[PDB]
Structures are given as C-alpha cells and as structure tokens.
Design a protein around this nucleic acid. Structure first.
Ligand SMILES: [Zn+2]
Ligand SMILES: [Zn+2]
Ligand SMILES: [Zn+2]
Ligand SMILES: [Zn+2]
Lengths: 98, 148, 145, 94, 48, 248, 68, 277, 193, 48
RNA sequence: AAAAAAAAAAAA
C-alpha cells in the first residue's frame, strides 16, 4: 500500500504538472490496470477523456484496455461513445466492426 | 453636573440631601464593591447582574422616597435624577400600568431579542411551570411582572 | 488589545508591543522571522495614530492625577499636536501627512509670534492648542475611509 | 378553466399505486399570517394554563398565593441590613 | 411526513423563521478553499 | 431555504420559533459553509440550542435529519444502518474528493440521483437463520464451605461469549454485596469476590456447584483468587466441556 | 540518564530512559546503514547499537518490575 | 431527597494560566510559546479529583428541566456549584441514550477521530469501548479493574491484556462509556499513577468483529421490527409455521399459484391490497 | 474564557479610527476640569465610540478662547519657570491605569479660567465656563443644543472678551485685491500679489 | 531503502512501528479514487 | 519678496 500510494502520488503529480501530455495518463491508467484496479483505471481514462475529448489514440487505448480484461459490454459502450464523438475517424469504425 | 468640579466651582446640593446622603453613599459603596466581585466561578453574563440590581435598588429608594413617603422635595428629586443618583427612564416605567416592578430597561427592549419578545422575567409566574426558577440572563431577575 | 491579539494570532510572540505602542523584537531575529514579522502600512499607521491618541489621553490623565496642573496640560497638548513628526513615526506610513505637520508648524509660528509680545518671555507655556487640534481632526476625517 | 368546478370535480383515472413533499422530511410552503395570530397560538400552546377556564378574581387569587410563596421584597427606603430591598431578584421558595 | 419508524399523522406546524442577529464586529468566519475545476460539460460530436 | 428536521428533534410545540443564519457554520461532514437553522427545545430555560448540524446536500446523501444525524426511515445511526444493510454510501469520504463531488453533483443529488425497503427484509431473513475423559458431576466438596475463613472467591467456568457481565452481576446481587466480578470471556473464566463470607456461603448453598444463566450452563466452586494469564486453547476447550458437563 | 538502572522504579523516568535508548539505537542503525562507514566504523556502530539495546533492555526490565 | 454535594471548595477552583513552558504566553491561543520543543507534550499530570457516586450525587437545577445533559465536571470530580449547577449531577442510567451528535455532557461529536485518540469522540462509530493503559503491572490487575471500572455504568465486557498494563472496557451504554472515560482519565487505580483512559480503536480479533457486526444487525433488526407491523414481520422471518401457512393462504388473492411478491404483499399504504395498517 | 469574544474583538479594529476621531473631537477644553460624554460601547468591551458632536456657540467659543489667550499670556508672564511635561507621560512598560483605582473620585486641579469681574462681566458671569453654556435656559432650543439666541449685554460681553482673537476690520474695501477672486486670478496669470 | 530495511528489522523484532508519510498540504490517494469519474452507461448492461 | 518599506545585506 505504501508503494501504491507513492506511485499514485507520483502519477498524480505528473498529471497536475503537465496534463496535456497523454503519456502521463497512459502510464497511470496502465499501472492501475496492473494491480487490477479497474474502477481506478476507468476513472483515470475518463479524466483523460475530459482533458482530451477528441484524441483518437486515447479512445483506442481505452477500448483496448477494456477489451484485454474481457470487459466486453463496457468496451462496446465505449466504442459506441467513440463513434458518437468522432464519426469521421474511420479507425474507430474499423476497430468497432473488427 | 455628573462631571467633577474641583472644590470652588462645585455648587451645593439642594436642601434635604444630607439626610439621605448616608444611604446614597451606602449604594455607591455597594456598587464599588460590585465592581470587584470575582468572575472566575460564574458565567460571564452573571458578572454584570449585581450592577443592575444595585442600580434598581438605588432608583427604587429615590422613587419611593419621593412618591410614597414624600420625604424629599421636588427640587431635590430632580437634582438626584439629573446627577445620576437614579435612573429616570426606569422610574418612568415604574409609574406605568404593568411596569411598576420592572427590573431594568433592557428587559423590555423588544427590538433587540431574537423573536421580538420581552424577557422571560416579564411573564406572570402563573403562566410558568412549577419548579422553574428562571433567572434572567440580562440582570438575574427572577420575575418582575406586576402581579408577582 | 486588538494590536496585541493580531500579533499573537499571527504567532509573532517574539515581537513585544509596549503600552506606548512601540513594536520591538524581544530577541535577535532570523531572516525568516524578519520576513514573517514585517507588518504593513495599515497596521503601522493605526499603531501610530493610537500612539498619538495615547499621548493626548495620558496628558489628560497626568492632569487628573495631580502631577501636572492645567497650564502644563495645555502647553503639553499644544506641544504634542505640534510635534507629531518628532513624537511619532506616523509620517513613515503615510507621507502626505507631512502637509498636516507643515500646517501645524505654520500655525505655531503665527501663534507664537503673537503670543510672545512684551512681558511674555520665551519658553514653554503656550497652551493655545485649538488650531493644531483642528488640523489633526481633519486629518482623521480624511484618513478614516 | 382549469379552475372551474367541473374541472376540479373530475378525478384522476386509472388504478392506484400499491407501493409530493417539498423538503426531505415533509411538505413546507410559504404562508402569510398576522404576527398576533402566531403569537396567540404559540402562547396558547406554550403557557401552562392555555385554556382552563378562569376569570379575573381567582386568577388574582392564584397570583396572591404565588406572591406569598416568594420571599419578602423588602423596603426600598432601607438601604442596608435586614429589610433591605431585594425586589424582582427575590427567589421562589423550594 | 412519517419518519423514524412510527407512522402516526403528526399535527401540521406553523414555523416562524427569523434571521439571526449577527455581531457587527465579527470578521469572516471561514477560510477560502482552492478546489480544482470540475469536468466540463459533455463535449459534442465532432462534425467534420 | 428550509431545513430537513425530523419531528422528535423539532419542539413539541406545533408553533416553532426558528433562527436562520446564512453560512453560520461548516457542515460536520463536507466542511462547507451552509445555512444553519436553530431552535429552542422543549427543555425550557436551560439546555442546548438545537440546530442543523449538517448541510442539506449531505442530508440527502445520508438520508438523515440535519440535527440528530440518524436515518429518517428507521431512526438508526448512519453507520449502523450502512453496516447492517450493506449500502453504497453514495459519495466519497476523503478530504478534497468531498468538495469535488459536492461541487460537481449538487444539482443531481437534489433531484434524488447519484430506497432500501427490501434489504431490511433481507436482513430480517438473514437474522432468522442466525447460526451464532469427561470430569465427573460435582460432589459435595465443591459447594461445601472451606475451613479457611480467608477463602472468598467463587470461580465460574463455562462462560460463553454471549453472556454479559451485568447478567452475572445482578444474578449474584440477590445473595449479597459483591466487591468485585471479573469475567474473562476469552478464557471462559469468572471470579466473584464478595464482601461478607455469608453471601458466598449462601451462593454455594443455593447454587450447589451448578448454575444456568440465560440458558448458559456454568459451574461454580470455591476458590482463592488467582490471576488469569496467557492460557492454552486445549485447557480452555476442556474447561468449556467441563462447564457443559456441569449439567450432565 | 542514571547509571543505576535497577534502582529506578519510577514508570515515567524508566519510559524516558527507554525512549532515549531506542532513539540512540535507531541513530546507531542509521549510522551503520551509511556506506561511508569502514570496518572500524561498522564495528563501533554495532557496539553502540548493542550498548543501546542493553540499556533499553535494562530500562524495560526496571519498568516491568515497577510499572510499564 | 438529597441535594448535590459540592465536590471541591471554590477557594481551590480558579481559572489560572497553565504552568510556564515557554517565555511568552500567547493570548489568542492561550498557550505558552518559546523555550524548547523537547518539552512539548511533557507528561500527563494527576487530576485534582475523583468521584464517589454514592457520596456526590444529588439534585441540581436540571432535574426540573427535561432534556438536560450530564455534567462534565461532576464526572471530573471538580464541580463546586453543587445544587446550583445547570447540569445533572447523577450517574447515567441505562435509559440515558443520546443522539449521534452529542455526548452525555452535550459536547458536539465529530466526523472523524483525532490521531491522539481522545476527546469527545466521533459519531461514525458507536464506540462503547474505552482503552485504559499506564497501569502498575502487578498480578491482581483484573480484580482492581473490575472493582474500579464499575461505578460509572453497566458493563458488557472487560478484556484485561495483562503484562502490557492495558485493558479494554466495553459498557452496554455509550453515555456510560463517555462518563467512564471522562471520569477515570488521569486518575489512580491503587498506586500513584496517571491512567491514560482514551477511546479504544477496533479489536482486530475476528471474533470481536463478528460480535460487533451481529450486534449492529440486531440493533437494526429491532428498529425495523419497531417500524413494521407485527403480522408483517412475523410473516417476514417465517420461523413460525402458522405464519408461513398464513403467507401461503393470504398471498393468493383468487389466482392460484401466485405466491405474491414481497413488494406487493409486504406493502404499507392507503391503497395497498393487504390488511395494510 | 473570552476566546468566543476574540474574533469579534479583533474585528472592531476595523472601526477603531472613528473611535479615535470621536474621542479626539470631544476632548475637554482648557477651562473644563472634566467632561462627561455619551458613549456607545460594545457589550463585550471591544469598542467605545464617543457618541457626541462638540456643538458650541461660536461667539461663546471665541470669547472662551480669548479669555484663554489672556490667561495663558498672563501666566507665562507671571510664572518663575514653566516646566514642560515629559513626553511620553508614562513609561513604555507601565501598565495602563485603571479608572476605578486611580482617577475615579480624585480631586481635580482647577482648570485654566480667567477671573471675571462680578459687575463688569455681569452678563456672562454665572455660565461662561460651563461645558454647554445656557443649555437649561431659554437661550438655547433644548438639550440637543442646536440653536442659540443671546441678548445685547451678553453679545457685548462676549465681543469684549474676544478682543485678542477678533478682527478689527470693518471696511470690506480693506480686502481690495487680497481676496479669493484676486488670488485665483493671479494663480491663473502665474503672478503673485 | 534504508528506512525499508530498518522497518523490516524492527518488524521482525516483535513491535509493529507505524509508518506515516502524511505531510501537511497532502491529498489521500488510497482512501477513495481521486476525482472519481465513473464511465458513462450505454446500451449494454455492465453490472456482471 | 525666500524650494525635509522592499529589492539589499539567502531548505530534521
Ligand atoms: Zn432585567
Ligand atoms: Zn429579564
Ligand atoms: Zn425582570
Ligand atoms: Zn432529528
């Protein structure tokens, strides 16, 4: 728990320091995925989607992170949101049909 | 004048003052003793109760020396009221129907309560509960209604 | 008591405010303590106005105790209202106040040159304090808002 | 309309729920009454003696027993010692 | 309404609400807290 | 502009004189300034000025009276209700997250967004199916008074965890004045020290080495007072079996 | 601290002595954790830690005898 | 009856400054400042009075007023007013229950505990457990604890962790626990010691955990049984076979093979289809 | 015990300037040994505001300060050696003097007053050095002390007592090219009279 | 690291010394999810 | 025809 708190503190300090860099959000969410904290990783990804709404890479990585943990209905809701927000990005549609 | 004059600009009090002067200094020394009463054991608002009580007692002494016994002249009475030996407004309330035993003026200041009431000590004792020894937070009054 | 409470709330208990409204460090101050304890113009202006008021009130208290008589009281009041720049550091926190000081000096000259004519020799004794007292009341009128 | 009698007379159709309030604990609305009405009703509830039918002479009698239960008020022309004026600061014996 | 168990119909109430007398000398009672910004309104679809 | 206060916190008088102070205090949960409503209780002429202790948003989140801070459906404390009904507690309880959630959700909490009923029945059904060489029977020497008049203690064995100390105390209060009663539920031991030996002799006379308190069988003997220390689980089990064997 | 550990019977004095000995043992352990300590320095740190542990043991024995 | 006994004379009770642990007395915080931080908390002194319930109890100017709280200083043994005190000067009984916002003395309870866990307490835990330490380690700890932790209320369970000099006293009433904590703090048991009577944390023993969880569950069950009608709850547990038969026969409403849901059957209202209430 | 007052106490610092001005505007004159003023005070003791405006009759105030001018000139001529009082009057570490134990019933020294002739100054003799002269007489409107009217002997006496501090200019032609209009005209032309 | 080994060494020797890194001005990241933004529900049920 | 603080003396 001390390690988890220190890593969370470091990641949140990097997010507060420069929130417009996607790597901080990606690292924090992937790390929180590694300790199977799916609600925490979902919250971090949704906060990143609040900072970066129209980023296709963040949408792709969050759908992928939802899929690799066998959360099918969550990821299908996520793909519906992604093709609703960006209907002219063919990458999201191609991933969704695939 | 309530402002002190040295010795040669002092005017003498009206006649009959020296008869009641000993009781007036009794009240003055009682108030001076009330200035030096420990507040360490009593609530803060209870530290100010004896001053209102002694002011009531001195004003009542002057009031019933002039109006009941009539043992002092009118000029002496107005000089006592003008030189701070009695509270003229509390006396003025004492001459009214229903306020003859009023403890102090602050207990009928309705504009300065939470719900525009008088004090609870203004209430007749019959409309209050038994074993209810109320004690006014303004002055320590235990009931000053005229019927009490 | 308000100035003392403000000092003690800010935990600056190494500053002592004495009863004549002087603020002195009780010990040797570090750089951090000197930076924390540096009050502003509002506190210091209010402190100096309280100091002048204390001088006036204390002159009246000395008259009422019997230590000085009424002529000494009037001369001291006229001295105090004419020497605000010497008896206070009040000008340090509001410098336009120097105008008032200059005004009092001007009044003093006129008063003094009409007060010492003939047998009235030079020295202390002029208790004609009303014009300088006026000047500082109008200063207070301006300085309250 | 919709304030007429035939509009208020018609009920709501359909069945009733087998399983509203302005605040979390009840329904509270702003109302306008005289100050004297609230004071009189609060007095009727609050005063021990609200109701209980009573004329002036026996109320004066109850006042007389209540007054003689209390300590002596004292003489206001006696400034010191026994008999000195105590007044409204006289306590009730119990 | 009915609450805390019992369901008896309590009598309806008339409540006098008066603003409290405040000390004119009282300073502001509480400090100001710097809370971070909440999330924005849900962004619209991108209609390129 | 109106508090959410239960009836038992409100005065018995149907006419309430109420004071209202905008930003009069901080909420006792989220530490935000809120409008405080206050009134005088039925305890006339001294007591405590009852007031809204928490804000209205926290009173919607907790479903509680603003004064007493108890559940407005059963009259239970909030934590008791939440532990015994396994509720979500809809809102963070951290420091900054409280103001964040209140700042971002104060319009949906008011409309009842972000009903237990059935979970109370679930708790009642769950508590319906609650599921919470032997020594010879005691001979006469166990309850006969010893020759030593200094012997005062009465040793009890067989005490279960469901038996409180007060039931033993007022079960033995009828025999005399008890100086001390030590009940260790960890070791299933108890020591009764009286003030007069007559009371202990009467306890031994009308107990006769056996006792039943609230359906729990216990064994009583005379004993010199000795302390109870760190003691083995097997010995605890065998005197629990002995206390059960007090009623063969 | 007093030299006679066994003569101390006061609970607060024994607790203060034990706290001081524990602080000294922690300081000795922190000094031993430093890589700059040579063989003589590590031996001195180990001896100081052992002495602090013995003093803490004596203080705790006195406390357990007379309150603690 | 009996008036309240004045405990300490007013000559010994003053309101003076704390002992000088510094150079300047800070008057806003009323605390000494200066000196050295090695002093800091220093030590916990011995209190100026204990309580005898059989000797110090009586009536005050609070038995006439319903809803009056108990006295903190009568619990501390240093209340000089006697019968003129505005608070009660008697022991809390078993029917002296208080809401989860105040203690028995009327002080406001807090959201969370303080780290140095003492004071009034928190309302997020119905804590009836008091943690006492600093006991002179002897062999007769249990008898003297049971003798002296008994005049403050009615006691459920005292576990004396001997050798450590630590005991955990659980009263059946929270007000009695607060009274005992405010009464035995900085007192002496048999020898001249200062007891650290503080608020107990949570017993990690899983047996104590399931005991507390169960007791919470029947407290809530008692509240629900008070809320619901007797026939309703009697059908709800269904331990009585006759109540089960009543549920089978009554929850049919003409249509056979229904077995009506608990939302429809166990419903309260004017328009429900049930005996209602 | 007074912690619940402290914030309020400190808040009244915000209103201590008026108090100072109020006190400084109601200070007794040299001919008054003491003055009673009406004060509005906070119930916790944080702020005393002198609730008076020092209203004077201007002819009376002129005559009183003219008599002061005479008396101080005569005394500074007559005194052997005038001793100036020490500023500050009290030491920095001396605690403030209590009213009740130091001043309250203490005999005041006699104030500066010109000795009026009983027959020449007969119009003002009985009221000249009062704090609010003629306040109980029909020469003023009432105790609020807002309007005055005076007789011819009184105005003559006040004018005679004011001759140290009264103008002797009768002709307005004395102020030819030495008035506000000419000063402003010279300011406009950047010249000096 | 050195604090970690000394904490482990004192953990082995009976006593459980509490470790605290709670400075002032510091947020709690382990109590609840910091600035928790739950995912928006969709047409697919995700309770399982 | 007669004008009178800060930079700047540094985070167990
Ligand atoms: Zn009164
Ligand atoms: Zn009153
Ligand atoms: Zn009264
Ligand atoms: Zn309530």
């Amino acid at each position: 728990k001390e390690y988890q708190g220190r890593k969370r503190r470091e990641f949140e300090d990097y997010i507060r320091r420069n929130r417009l860099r996607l790597q901080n959000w990606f690292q924090y969410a992937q790390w929180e995925l590694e300790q199977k904290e799916f609600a925490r990783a979902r919250s971090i990804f949704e906060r990143a989607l609040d900072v970066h709404p129209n980023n296709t890479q963040l949408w792709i990585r969050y759908i992928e992170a939802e899929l690799k943990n066998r959360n099918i209905n969550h990821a299908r809701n996520l793909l519906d949101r992604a093709v609703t927000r960006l209907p002219r990005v063919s990458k999201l549609w191609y991933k969704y049909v695939y | 004048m309530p402002a002190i004059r040295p010795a040669s600009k002092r005017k003498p009090p009206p006649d009959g003052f020296s008869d009641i002067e000993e009781d007036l200094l009794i009240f003055a020394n009682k108030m001076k003793d009330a200035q030096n009463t420990p507040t360490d054991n009593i609530p803060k608002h209870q530290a100010q109760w004896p001053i209102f009580q002694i002011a009531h007692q001195r004003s009542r002494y002057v009031y019933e020396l002039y109006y009941q016994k009539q043992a002092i002249s009118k000029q002496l009475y107005d000089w006592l009221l003008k030189n701070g030996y009695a509270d003229a407004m509390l006396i003025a309330k004492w001459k009214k129907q229903g306020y003859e035993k009023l403890c102090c003026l602050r207990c009928i200041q309705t504009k300065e309560t939470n719900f525009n009431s008088t004090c609870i000590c203004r209430v007749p004792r019959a409309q209050l509960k038994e074993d209810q020894d109320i004690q006014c937070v303004n002055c320590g009054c235990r009931g000053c209604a005229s019927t009490d | 008591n308000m100035l003392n409470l403000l000092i003690h709330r800010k935990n600056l208990t190494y500053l002592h405010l004495d009863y004549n409204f002087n603020l002195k460090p009780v010990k040797t101050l570090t750089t951090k303590e000197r930076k924390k304890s540096r009050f502003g113009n509002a506190f210091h202006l209010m402190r100096e106005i309280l100091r002048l008021t204390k001088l006036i009130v204390d002159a009246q208290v000395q008259y009422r105790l019997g230590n000085i008589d009424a002529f000494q009281l009037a001369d001291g009041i006229h001295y105090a209202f004419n020497h605000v720049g010497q008896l206070t550091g009040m000008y340090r926190y509001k410098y336009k106040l120097m105008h008032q000081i200059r005004s009092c000096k001007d009044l003093k000259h006129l008063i003094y040159y009409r007060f010492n004519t003939g047998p009235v020799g030079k020295g202390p004794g002029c208790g004609f304090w009303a014009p300088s007292w006026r000047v500082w009341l109008f200063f207070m009128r301006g300085i309250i808002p | 309309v919709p304030y007429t009698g035939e509009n208020l007379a018609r009920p709501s159709y359909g069945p009733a729920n087998p399983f509203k309030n302005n605040v979390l604990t009840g329904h509270a609305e702003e109302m306008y009454i005289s100050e004297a009405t609230f004071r009189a009703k609060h007095r009727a509830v609050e005063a021990v003696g609200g109701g209980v039918m009573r004329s002036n002479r026996e109320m004066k009698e109850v006042n007389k027993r209540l007054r003689e239960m209390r300590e002596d008020k004292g003489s206001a022309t006696i400034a010191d010692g026994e008999g000195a004026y105590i007044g409204p600061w006289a306590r009730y014996k119990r | 309404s009915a609450q805390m168990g019992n369901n008896t119909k309590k009598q309806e109430r008339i409540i006098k609400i008066v603003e409290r007398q405040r000390d004119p000398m009282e300073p502001p009672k509480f400090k100001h807290k710097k809370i971070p910004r909440g999330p924005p309104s849900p962004p619209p679809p991108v209609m390129h | 502009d109106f508090p959410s206060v239960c009836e038992n916190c409100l005065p018995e008088n149907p006419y309430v004189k109420m004071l209202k102070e905008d930003y009069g205090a901080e909420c006792k949960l989220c530490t935000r300034p809120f409008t405080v409503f206050s009134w005088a209780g039925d305890g006339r002429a001294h007591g405590r000025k009852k007031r809204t202790n928490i804000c209205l948003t926290c009173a919607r989140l907790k479903n509680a009276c603003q004064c007493c801070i108890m559940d407005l459906q059963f009259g239970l404390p909030i934590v008791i209700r939440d532990k015994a009904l396994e509720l979500i507690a809809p809102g963070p309880q951290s420091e900054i997250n409280r103001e964040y959630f209140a700042q971002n959700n104060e319009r949906a909490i008011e409309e009842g967004r972000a009903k237990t009923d059935e979970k109370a029945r679930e708790l009642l059904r769950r508590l319906a199916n609650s599921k919470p060489a032997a020594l010879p029977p005691p001979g006469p020497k166990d309850w006969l008074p010893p020759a030593d008049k200094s012997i005062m203690s009465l040793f009890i064995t067989g005490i279960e965890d469901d038996l409180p100390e007060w039931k033993i105390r007022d079960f033995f209060k009828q025999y005399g004045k008890i100086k001390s009663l030590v009940v260790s539920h960890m070791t299933h031991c108890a020591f009764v020290n009286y003030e007069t030996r007559e009371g202990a002799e009467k306890a031994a006379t009308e107990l006769k080495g056996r006792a039943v308190i609230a359906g729990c069988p216990l064994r009583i003997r005379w004993s010199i007072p000795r302390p109870i220390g760190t003691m083995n689980k097997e010995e605890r089990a065998e005197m629990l079996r002995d206390g059960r064997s007090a009623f063969p | 601290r007093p030299r006679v550990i066994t003569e101390v019977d006061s609970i607060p004095a024994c607790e203060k002595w034990r706290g001081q000995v524990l602080k000294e043992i922690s300081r000795k352990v922190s000094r031993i954790q430093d890589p700059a300590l040579s063989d003589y320095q590590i031996r001195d740190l180990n001896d100081e830690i052992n002495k602090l542990m013995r003093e803490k043991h004596m203080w705790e024995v006195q406390i357990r005898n007379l309150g603690g | 009856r009996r008036p309240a006994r004045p405990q300490i004379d007013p000559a010994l009770v003053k309101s003076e400054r704390p002992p000088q642990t510094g150079t300047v007395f800070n008057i806003w915080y009323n605390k000494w400042s200066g000196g050295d931080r090695e002093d800091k908390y220093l030590s916990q002194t011995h209190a100026k009075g204990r309580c005898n319930i059989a000797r110090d109890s009586g009536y005050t100017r609070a038995d006439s007023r319903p809803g009056s709280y108990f006295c903190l200083y009568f619990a501390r043994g240093i209340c000089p007013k006697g019968q003129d005190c505005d608070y009660l000067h008697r022991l809390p009984t078993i029917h002296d229950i208080f809401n989860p916002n105040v203690d028995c003395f009327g002080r406001d309870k807090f959201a969370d505990y303080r780290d140095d866990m003492g004071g009034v307490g928190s309302f997020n835990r119905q804590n009836r457990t008091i943690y006492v330490g600093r006991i002179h380690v002897t062999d007769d700890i249990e008898e003297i604890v049971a003798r002296h932790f008994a005049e403050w209320g009615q006691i459920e369970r005292i576990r004396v962790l001997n050798n450590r000099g630590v005991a955990f006293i659980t009263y059946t009433n929270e007000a009695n626990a607060q009274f005992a904590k405010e009464a035995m703090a900085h007192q002496s048991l048999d020898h001249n010691e200062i007891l650290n009577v503080r608020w107990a944390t949570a017993d990690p023993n899983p047996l104590a955990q399931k005991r507390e969880q169960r007791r919470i569950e029947e407290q809530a069950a008692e509240a629900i049984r008070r809320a619901l009608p007797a026939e309703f709850v009697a059908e709800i547990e269904g331990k009585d076979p006759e109540a089960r038969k009543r549920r089978k026969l009554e929850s049919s409403y003409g249509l056979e093979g229904y077995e009506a849901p608990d939302a429809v059957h166990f419903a309260r209202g004017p328009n429900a289809v049930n005996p209602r209430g | 015990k007074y912690t619940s007052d402290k914030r309020s106490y400190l808040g009244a610092l915000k209103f201590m300037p008026h108090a100072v001005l109020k006190l400084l505007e109601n200070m007794p004159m040299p001919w008054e040994a003491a003055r009673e003023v009406k004060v509005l005070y906070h119930v916790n003791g944080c702020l005393t505001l002198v609730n008076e405006i020092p209203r004077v009759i201007e002819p009376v105030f002129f005559a009183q300060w003219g008599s002061m001018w005479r008396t101080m000139r005569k005394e500074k001529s007559d005194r052997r050696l005038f001793k100036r009082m020490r500023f500050p009057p009290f030491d920095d570490e001396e605690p403030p003097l209590s009213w009740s134990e130091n001043i309250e019933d203490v005999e005041p020294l006699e104030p500066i007053q010109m000795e009026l002739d009983e027959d020449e100054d007969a119009a003002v003799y009985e009221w000249f050095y009062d704090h609010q002269p003629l306040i109980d007489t029909p020469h003023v409107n009432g105790p609020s002390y807002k309007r005055w009217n005076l007789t011819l002997p009184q105005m003559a006496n006040l004018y005679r007592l004011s001759e140290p501090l009264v103008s002797d200019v009768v002709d307005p032609n004395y102020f030819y090219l030495f008035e506000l209009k000419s000063f402003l005209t010279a300011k406009a032309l950047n010249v000096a009279l | 690291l050195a604090a970690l080994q000394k904490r482990r060494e004192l953990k082995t020797a009976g006593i459980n010394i509490k470790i605290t890194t709670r400075k002032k001005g510091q947020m709690d990241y382990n109590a609840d999810i910091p600035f928790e933004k739950k995912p928006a529900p969709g047409f697919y049920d995700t309770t399982e």
